[PDB]
Design a protein around this nucleic acid. Structure first.
Lengths: 173, 33, 241, 131
RNA sequence: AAGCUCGUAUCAGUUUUAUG
RNA sequence: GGAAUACUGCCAGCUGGGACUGAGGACUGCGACGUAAGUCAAGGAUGCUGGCAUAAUGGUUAUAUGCCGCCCGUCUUGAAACACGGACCAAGGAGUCUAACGUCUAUGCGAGUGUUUGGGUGUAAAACCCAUACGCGUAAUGAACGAGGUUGGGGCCUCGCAAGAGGUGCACAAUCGACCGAUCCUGAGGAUGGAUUUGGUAAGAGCAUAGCUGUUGGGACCCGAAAG
RNA sequence: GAAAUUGUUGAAAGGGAAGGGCAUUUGAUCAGACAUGGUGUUUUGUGCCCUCUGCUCCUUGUGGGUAGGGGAAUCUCGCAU
């Protein structure tokens, strides 16, 4: 039963539970809509669930029902949302007919967040960066410091400058 | 959530003692013998 | 084919509609009752104001007639006194402390209305050094009930801010408004005890202008603070309040 | 001052929430009594023998009244003329269950009794001897 | 600390009254 | 002859100067203005303006200075005092284990309970099952005289809008009492008949496991006491 | 390569010693966007967009995946300027 599973996952070491310093428990399950391990939010403890996911740029409406609880292979019935904010929201509302207000509202919120996350193309389209984050290991740092000091010591910059000056102004102007 | 002290802020004062409006309009406080 | 609403959802909707109809009917009845009670409270307040004016005019006229006739006037005995704690909650002997606790004077600058009786007079005399009391006037009682008027509801100090609050608890004895409570307190009646018990003990601050004496711990008849100050108690309370 | 039970059983916790919900949303004293009894320890919840239930059934109108035992029902070999009645308890022993079923009666759980009697309709509560 | 009977008329480091 | 002023107390009278707080978070309520629409200082602040990315601002050290602060731990005596340790620092250091007897707590069974002394079995000190025995309890000092009648009793049902009235009642308490066996006598060898009461049954509650925890003996919270 | 401890350098303070707390000024010093868009419009080119023909998965649903031929003068359904 869901209640037994809900109790077994609240306590008794649910696999995906993150103990944040604030005390909030964060769920890392991909199918979760809020990412938090709470009631009516964890897909495992809820026979009926709805979430929005996307492999490619297309956004899908993943939903779960008790019918496929016996068949974990094809539990979710994803449907394409025909990417467009207004019509996608209308389609989500139509699909989630008579569903809980919580599920509908949070699915719409997840879809909106994912759609606005697609703006990442803006950063990729207008980046023209000349820095490209570079990491330097401490071992490389040591070889770039002690060797530099040795080169400076062996260079004899003052002596070289004096020799060059004594040569330039000894055979011409 | 917050206590509205009467004797000031006539708005709350009128909520209690509905005779306050009559008292003020009639100037009963300065009644003459 | 068309998707039909869940049967449980249909039952929930039917129950919600049926409950909402009753809620609207109750709201209309409550509005009508509130209007009627507001009218009743208005007429009661007018009657109480007229009664107070007539009483004061009669007292003054009786005093003047007694003066003119050459016969001494028999002033009515006082029946209501307000007692305010002066000393602290430490170093108090057990006997006065028990009386103060019985009077709900558990902290400094705290007071309550006490009925005047032969028995209560002895209690006040017992705790005379640690308390100051007098004869409150109508204005002081009204100001106290209006500003620091807190009622005791199911062991909770619910502030008094609406006639409905008083009516719910004190409506059994006919007290359905703050004005009714003030009238009962000032004019001791059959249900004075219940009204006094319902009111939470008053929490008063230090006087705005100060106690006015270099040493509080002395009899009021000798420049002190405690004792029995007949009329100066009103001024003391007003400064404290 | 008893507020919650010390038992870690999940089913007992579910029964406790159900009884608390019924008590808070029905104001029926019958639900409150069972809710309070649920928090009692094992020692405070002595078993109620089937013979004790049969003796208690001797009162008038026992057929129309169901019997509810907070603790566990234990079989008794000293009684054989067990009447036909519905018994609800947290646990039923094999012997007691067989005796109740054999005599034509029915044994149910606390939730079954609650659904059958949300406000304790014709419900009799029996407490076993303390010592 | 747990249990039962419970909210009262169970009482007072108080006062009067009564019996003396 | 006449008013005015001083003092006391009231104003649900009017109106300026200053300081802190902005708590709640879509409406449900008490209220006011308004014929109405609508508005409001009515169960907690809103609108506008000025400073800002080589920012605005914020954080650490000492000194600059308004005030306060006896040297830490243990132990004497009602207190302070006095007594014993402390030159500084890194590591170690102390209610830990076991046998028996118990309370509370949870589980499994329940008038039954305890697989593991051993055998079978085994992916091998791992995991699973128990033929007979054995520990505990299940019946007092015939329990049906009859597995008991009254008064209360958490609860249940009827009447009642409620107040309350009526019917039935677990555990548990008083009472009426009876009984198993026997006192205290008697006196057909010990029957019969009198006088008190006796500790409890009337319709079981225990077993094993696990956690905090109490007592006793074991080095027994750690070191240290003349020694045969 | 930790503390006690010792030496050099820099800074600060000091008349018969000091340390700590509430509280502010000062030097020195540290942190201080790899933030940068959003809205509806106005052109152009594309696509998962329009049109014709198709292939394939479950089970069958308010579905999923994937090709071939044509276009913008219907086109803001998204993307690009």
């Amino acid at each position: 039963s869901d209640e037994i599973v809900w109790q077994v996952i609240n306590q008794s070491f649910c696999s995906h539970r993150i103990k944040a310093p604030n005390g909030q428990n964060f769920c890392r399950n991909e199918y979760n809509v809020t990412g938090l391990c709470t009631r009516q939010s964890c897909p495992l403890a809820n026979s009926k669930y709805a979430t929005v996911k996307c492999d490619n740029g297309k956004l899908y409406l993943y939903m779960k029902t008790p019918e496929r609880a016996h068949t974990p292979a094809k539990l979710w019935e994803r449907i394409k949302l025909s990417k467009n904010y207004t019509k996608a929201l209308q389609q989500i509302d139509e699909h989630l007919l008579h569903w809980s207000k919580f599920f509908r509202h949070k699915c719409k919120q997840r879809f909106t967040k994912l759609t606005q996350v697609m703006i990442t193309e803006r950063r990729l389209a207008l980046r023209e960066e000349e820095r490209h984050y570079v990491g330097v290991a401490p071992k490389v740092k040591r070889r770039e410091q002690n060797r530099e000091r040795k080169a400076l010591v062996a260079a004899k910059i003052e002596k070289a400058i004096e020799k060059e000056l004594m040569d330039r102004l000894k055979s011409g102007a | 959530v917050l206590k509205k002290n009467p004797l000031k802020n006539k708005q709350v004062l009128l909520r209690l003692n509905p005779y306050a409006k009559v008292f003020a309009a009639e100037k009963l406080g300065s009644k003459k013998a | 084919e068309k998707i039909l609403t869940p049967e449980s959802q249909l039952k929930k909707s039917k129950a919600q509609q049926k409950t909402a109809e009753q809620v609207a009917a109750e709201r209309a009845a409550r509005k009508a009752a509130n209007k009627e009670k507001r009218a009743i409270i208005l007429e009661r307040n007018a009657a109480y104001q007229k009664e107070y004016e007539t009483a004061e005019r009669n007292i003054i006229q009786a005093k003047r007639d007694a003066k003119a006739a050459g016969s001494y006037y028999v002033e009515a005995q006082h029946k209501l006194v307000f007692v305010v704690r002066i000393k602290g909650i430490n170093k108090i002997p057990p006997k006065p402390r028990k009386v103060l606790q019985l009077l709900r004077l558990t902290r400094i600058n705290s007071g309550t209305f006490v009925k005047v009786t032969k028995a209560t007079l002895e209690l006040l005399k017992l705790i005379e050094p640690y308390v100051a009391y007098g004869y409150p006037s109508y204005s002081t009682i009204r100001q106290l009930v209006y500003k620091r008027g807190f009622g005791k509801i199911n062991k909770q100090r619910v502030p008094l801010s609406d006639n409905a609050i008083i009516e719910a608890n004190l409506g059994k004895y006919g007290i359905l408004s703050i004005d009714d409570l003030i009238h009962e307190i000032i004019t001791v009646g059959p249900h004075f005890k219940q009204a006094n018990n319902f009111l939470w003990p008053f929490k008063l601050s230090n006087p705005s202008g100060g106690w006015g004496v270099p040493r509080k711990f002395k009899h009021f008849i000798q420049g002190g603070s405690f004792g029995n100050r007949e009329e100066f108690i009103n001024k003391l309370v007003k400064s404290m309040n | 001052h008893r507020t919650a039970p010390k038992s870690d059983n999940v089913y007992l916790k579910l029964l406790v929430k159900l009884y608390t919900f019924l008590a808070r949303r029905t104001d029926a004293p019958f639900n409150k009594v069972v809710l309070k009894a649920l928090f009692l320890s094992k020692i405070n919840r002595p078993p109620v023998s089937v013979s004790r239930i049969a003796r208690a059934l001797k009162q008038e109108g026992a057929a129309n009244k169901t019997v509810v035992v907070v603790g566990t029902v234990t079989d008794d070999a000293r009684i054989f003329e067990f009447p036909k009645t519905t018994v609800a308890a947290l646990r039923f022993t094999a012997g007691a269950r067989a005796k109740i079923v054999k005599a034509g009666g029915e044994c149910i759980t606390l939730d079954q009794l609650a659904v059958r009697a949300p406000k304790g309709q014709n419900t009799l509560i029996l407490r076993g001897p303390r010592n």
